[PDB]
Design a protein around this ligand. Sequence first.
Ligand SMILES: CC[C@H](C)[C@H](N)C(=O)N[C@@H](CCCC[NH3+])C(=O)O
Ligand SMILES: [Ca+2]
Ligand SMILES: [Ca+2]
Ligand SMILES: [Ca+2]
Ligand SMILES: [Ca+2]
Ligand SMILES: [Zn+2]
Length: 316
Amino acid sequence: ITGTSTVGVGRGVLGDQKNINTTYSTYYYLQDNTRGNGIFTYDAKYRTTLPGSLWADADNQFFASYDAPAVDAHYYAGVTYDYYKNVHNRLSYDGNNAAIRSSVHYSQGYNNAFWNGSQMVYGDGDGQTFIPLSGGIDVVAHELTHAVTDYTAGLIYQNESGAINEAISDIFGTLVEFYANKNPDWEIGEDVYTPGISGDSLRSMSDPAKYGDPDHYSKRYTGTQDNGGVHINSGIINKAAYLISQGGTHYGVSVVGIGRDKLGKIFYRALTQYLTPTSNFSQLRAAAVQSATDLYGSTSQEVASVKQAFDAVGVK
Ligand SMILES: CC[C@H](C)[C@H](N)C(=O)N[C@@H](CCCC[NH3+])C(=O)O
Ligand SMILES: [Ca+2]
Ligand SMILES: [Ca+2]
Ligand SMILES: [Ca+2]
Ligand SMILES: [Ca+2]
Ligand SMILES: [Zn+2]
């Protein structure tokens, strides 16, 4: 909508107060004009018609229970935009400041979130398995990273390319969570999963097997569920990324960690310059090796650690 840029205030899903960028034109809308061509947040009103209605509020205060998922979707899309721009010099998901659109209150009791090819979509959860999923910065950044991937490498969402697609989303979802630096970890979705259970998450990058996912190629899933295991086999790559950053010894193979910033630079370059729609795990190792060689040199510690990490998870 055409209007003037304003700053509202509200509370997110976990009860934290934050300022949001809004637009005033009769109502105050969740339209942030400060980032690219805009960040826009919509109400799906418990239905599945998308995007729904651009979020309108009479007073620019967003403290109602019903408001909280909107606040967080809007705010955390902004953080994710800021991460890509400030860390990687990328302007929105298409690199040309595309509008970022999200819908909240999707369906009833909907225990997921997704990128639909055009926008973000967040369920409210059923209140037992999940609370509204935009409450997780890593979840918001995971879903927006699918838009990045789709515009860049274009990894097909099945089998090994699909597991890479998912791992890239978990890696950058985690690096965004560290960038915002509130309560960061190497777990996925902990802030919105199972409010009745402390210390769990959907997936772990540090120890994928904690939630039943493989941490070595020899344990890969080869069945047909989950698009050939895209959220299962992602654990193999997630473990490699964890090892590259943090170091460790895994199945007797020691990796020297090089830290989060270098992990992000290596994987962002691989994603944007080397991976293709059909890349498999072997091709990801090659892309990461080439990326680290470009940035740091062939005889660098960074290259050595990339190789050691892929060796550790059985990917040649
Ligand atoms: C990043 C987390 C987000 C919910 C994502 N779409 C995801 O990982 N979903 C998988 C895990 C289950 C989510 C709720 N049932 C999934 O398999 O869809
Ligand atoms: Ca209000
Ligand atoms: Ca966390
Ligand atoms: Ca996390
Ligand atoms: Ca929990
Ligand atoms: Zn995903």
